Design a protein around this ligand. Structure first.
Ligand code: SAM
Ligand code: SAM
Ligand code: SAM
Ligand code: CL
Ligand code: CL
Ligand code: CL
Lengths: 264, 266, 267
């Protein structure tokens, strides 16, 4: 039942003190906790980007983790904060605005509460920063031995707002998916096409804003010459496009939501 | 005890430099927790660093060593100081005004110049007192060195302070200025405190190379206006701020620190 | 014992990737302290990563595991290595030259290839050996795994080394080059060590520098504040090598210079 590791995500940036003031509040409540950032460089207000960044956090982090996350343009409104215990035994705290959707896909909710108890908040709560005074504060209380049931009333899992996620499908001559996100440090393109779908089938890849490439399917970057394009399964088990030691989206610009079709 | 070190500088987080300081600190105080405030203070910008530190004493617990350096005077006669504040925290930094606003929040009770070689990383490199004096001294304090071992007592009046303009009641409203931009979002932060905005949609007059006059609703939070619409609100630091709901105010209406802001009834 | 993990990569700090590695490491070594060096090494730039690691052994205590990857060879025959240095630290990284300059600072005493599946995060994903081999193995070492259990011993000469030339005395001067930019400030760092400029300094301490990319006549100073704001200076940087800067301004914004550009210094 111990949760001494707090994994922390927001959209407030890492460039000023704000993300650190949250950690100050958390160390004051849970002075023995380990606090590690996931990132604070989610694009402003971008709940979907935050949700995508959290997707693989449950799997990589141990059971004694509190996932503390906010992207909270609804701060100071009726949009509540929730605290969840997942099937892995981790705790998650965040706004009920879809942010935790893909982390919960990875490890479903077992018990879910609205955070309404003043005793798990940093008082007085400032309306424009529930992320510090409710989300961070509550996560730290959970790390410091507070029972999940003490944060507020139980809700059903279906009361957690979920962001829709497009799945790739078999079409009439291949697999139709889309760009989910860019691997931005490198310029690699990540799709929603899972391992099991490319199983069936060099491949033709059609990128719609329209470009057709004939690409080798490789296990890794070094299997083609430097600067050459490849298809590969990324670290997350989904089909990706890259140039070996270059930047694919600088050569073929593509944004999230663009269609990607793969055929023999 | 002071086993939590909160660390700020202007050396950036993009290369190893900020981490070499943590290596020195972990060597001296291997049981300390080190947490960054930020290393992305603009280069040489002591005032920006001072503003970023202002609310650190209130948010961090009493067992914190606030370790901060923006030190273009490194290797000169500008000394490093170590301070114990009214909250019981310790602060270490260049006596160049960097700690000024943190000390406004929680005044100095005890002040020393850091002159003892035994709290430094020897030999001290002239271009990086931040590592070899500031960071090293903070770690010795985290490891339980008495504040008196760092060097001699000085009067708190010898702590260099940065000037800070106050807002005031003027003919028919409140006149202040822009203190900083909430840069992740483009929100505008003023020096107008909650207590002055009590008597009084409001007229907001921004004076820069051109004047921008807006009629804005006073809201508790962003979602009280439509997406893209402007609002006046009290920020998380208790001061009047301007923003657009889920958009960037300064991208629409450019404003920089030092610009005048008046708020008056419609 | 090695309870402190110092972590470097090229995956950036802007998304979750660097943190997923920390999650794996905390799972394996729950009592370890993890501190980033940086994740903002330029993509695939092994030499930049090697330069960022050069001064890590000296600054970090003996109980450190230096965990580093810049690994465009991930999923190939380029193995991960684990090394014990003369300071008693452990280092884990791709055998692609990344650890070269850290090993210059504190040489390898024992070296192994990381091949044992029991020090990896299974199943190992081919495009991220940095998570599933480098980070996982560093965590196992921090948790107390013996260095010899990671895989077979190799000779130090089997560690790939990136070439680095220090400057030399030529007819009447020092011929060096730009190694890296102090990018937060725009200061220029050369390969000219302390002992070479020492030999050439006279009373008044003024030098000529020729940049091939400009001739400047510059004062040799201890620190920035010795000349007026905006004025140029030569100085020995924090790492013991000659540098160029403007006091409280950006030298490379005025005089653009990139790594490998010649810098000649004469009386
Ligand atoms: C105001 S920020 C807190 C940090 C800020 N620098 C401070 O010190 O108050 C907290 C949340 O507010 C939201 N937010 C910030 N500016 C906003 C705006 N203009 N419109 C809507 N939401 C905003 C963000 O999504 C963020 O998660
Ligand atoms: C030199 S930096 C230390 C980090 C650097 N990357 C290193 O490894 O030496 C330390 C301090 O020097 C100051 N500084 C750096 N470059 C400067 C310059 N050109 N003029 C004046 N001060 C400078 C900064 O304000 C900073 O707080
Ligand atoms: C793929 S990155 C791991 C992080 C990534 N965001 C992920 O989640 O998989 C691991 C290593 O891959 C290398 N790498 C990434 N993209 C590459 C590409 N297009 N070509 C060659 N190497 C690449 C980098 O050098 C890096 O050290
Ligand atoms: Cl918030
Ligand atoms: Cl310094
Ligand atoms: Cl890798």
């Amino acid at each position: 039942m111990q949760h001494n590791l707090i994994a922390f995500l927001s959209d407030v940036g890492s460039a000023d003190e704000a993300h650190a003031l949250c950690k100050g509040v958390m160390y004051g409540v849970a002075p023995a906790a380990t606090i590690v950032d996931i990132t604070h460089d989610v694009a402003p207000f971008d709940v979907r980007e935050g949700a995508l960044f959290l997707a693989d956090v449950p799997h990589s982090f141990p059971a004694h983790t509190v996932i503390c996350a906010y992207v909270y343009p609804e701060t100071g409104t009726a949009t509540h904060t929730i605290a969840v215990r997942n099937e892995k035994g981790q705790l998650l705290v965040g706004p009920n605005n879809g942010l935790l959707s893909f982390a919960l896909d990875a490890s479903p909710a077992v018990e879910c509460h609205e955070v309404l108890s003043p005793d798990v908040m940093n008082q007085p709560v400032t309306p424009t920063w529930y992320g510090k005074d409710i989300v961070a504060a509550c996560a730290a209380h959970l790390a410091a031995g507070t029972d999940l049931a003490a944060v507020g009333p139980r809700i059903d899992p279906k009361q957690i707002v979920r962001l829709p996620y497009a799945s790739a499908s078999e079409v009439e001559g291949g697999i139709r998916g889309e760009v989910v996100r860019i691997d931005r440090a490198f310029g690699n393109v990540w799709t929603n096409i899972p391992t099991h779908l490319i199983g069936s089938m060099r491949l033709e890849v059609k990128i719609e804003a329209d470009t057709v490439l004939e690409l080798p399917f490789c296990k890794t970057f070094g299997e083609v010459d430097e600067g050459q394009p490849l298809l590969y399964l990324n670290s997350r088990g989904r089909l990706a496009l890259g140039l070996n030691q270059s930047n694919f989206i600088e050569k073929w610009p593509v944004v999230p939501g663009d269609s990607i079709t793969v055929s023999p």
